[PDB]
Ligand binder design. Structure first.
Ligand SMILES: CNc1nc2[nH]c(-c3cccc(CNC(=O)COC)n3)cc2c2c1ncn2C
Length: 258
């Protein structure tokens, strides 16, 4: 279930970048500034995983979740119309501001992200693509006495429809059980906290596919974060056994208790 957008209602503007089986553009709806996620020419199983994401995102509402306006489906074209968030992806921003992002700023982002994921967990919904690229900055929190404001974006094509090579490319955000899950987002959240702590440089992100697969096969563990208040929590989320990961209710409480 999602809103159908007619092709006449959307205008495509400049290219923002590439996603998994997609090209992202700034656009106009009706006029409202939006983002257009244009799926590549695809088989039906890929387009169905794109529809499942649009349906998931159309049935949720949370202050830290990005809005989905609908989907344009006509012949070979599939375009998801999503919320344009003022300052774009968190990973890109963190890399530009490297060395100048305070610890307190990172803690706020962590709590907002846990609140969005606690909301999804309570509705028994899995995101499957938690990473810095999918976290959007609505407010920067740069001025004295202000705080950042993030929105978790849609997960794009569902993990279940991707190739093994594409899953390997998602290491370290990919939960290890997904390599060959109501707990996969806890691992994705933990790897995103490391990515945030390291100013947008996630561990392993540069390693070759075979090096990434060996790390998981041997159950080597990711580094401790540079934020000392997040070390216990990241270690608990980044456990190979899925049943040992804490719930987002616990994660969100553990963050408020710091
Ligand atoms: C400003 N608002 C938004 N910007 C976005 N950029 C991307 C995006 C996606 C893939 C690769 C890149 C990297 N490209 C650059 O660094 C060059 O910059 C143009 N960027 C998605 C996205 C977005 C926004 N609001 C909602 N969403 C989903």
């Amino acid at each position: 279930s999602f809103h159908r957008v007619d092709q006449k209602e959307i205008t495509q503007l400049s290219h923002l970048g590439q996603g998994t089986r997609t090209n992202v553009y700034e656009g106009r709806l009706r006029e409202l500034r939006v983002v257009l996620k244009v799926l590549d020419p695809s088989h039906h199983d890929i387009a169905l995983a794109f529809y499942e994401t649009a349906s998931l995102m159309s049935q949720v509402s949370h202050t830290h979740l990005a809005f989905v306006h609908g989907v344009c489906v006509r012949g070979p074209e599939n375009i998801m119309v999503t919320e344009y968030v003022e300052h774009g992806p968190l990973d890109v921003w963190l890399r530009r501001e490297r060395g100048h992002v305070p610890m307190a700023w990172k803690m706020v982002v962590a709590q907002q992200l846990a609140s969005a994921l606690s909301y999804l967990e309570n509705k028994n919904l899995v995101h499957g693509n938690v990473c810095g690229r999918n976290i959007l900055l609505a407010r920067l929190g740069l001025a004295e006495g202000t705080s950042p404001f993030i929105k978790l974006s849609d997960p794009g094509v569902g993990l279940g429809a991707l190739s093994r090579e594409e899953r390997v490319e998602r290491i370290p955000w990919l939960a290890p059980e997904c390599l060959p899950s109501t707990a996969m987002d806890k691992w994705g959240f933990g790897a995103t906290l490391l990515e945030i702590c390291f100013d947008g440089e996630a561990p392993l992100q540069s390693r070759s596919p075979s090096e990434k697969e060996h790390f998981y096969q041997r159950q080597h563990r990711l580094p401790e974060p540079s934020c000392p208040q997040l070390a216990t929590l990241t270690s608990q989320c980044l456990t190979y056994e899925p049943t040992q990961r804490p719930s987002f209710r616990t994660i969100l409480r553990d963050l408020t208790r710091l």
